[PDB]
C-alpha cells in the first residue's frame, strides 16, 4: 500500500489508514480489508 | 481500539490508524496488529 492511503472493509466495515506501508496485508473479519 | 488510535503489527513494520472500528480485527502477517 502507498503511505497515507486509507483501507476499508465491506464486511465489519472497518476504515483504517496506512501510517506506515508493510510487506504483510491487512486482514480483517476472516477476510482482506479494501482499499480505498 | 477507540478511532484515533493506531495500530502497529509488530513484525513486518506495518502502522495504520482506526478511523473507523467494526466487529473485525486487523491481522497483519499472520499476526494480530498490536495497539500502540
Ligand atoms: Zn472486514
Ligand atoms: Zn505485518
Same mark, same amino acid.
Given at each position: 500500500?502507498? #503511505? %497515507? *492511503?486509507?483501507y476499508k472493509? #465491506? !464486511?465489519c466495515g472497518q476504515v483504517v489508514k496506512v501510517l506506515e506501508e508493510g %510487506? %504483510?496485508? !491487512?486482514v480483517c473479519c476472516g #477476510? *482482506?480489508?479494501v482499499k480505498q
Open positions: 500500500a502507498n #503511505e %497515507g *492511503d486509507v472493509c #465491506e !464486511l %510487506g %504483510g496485508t !491487512l #477476510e *482482506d480489508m
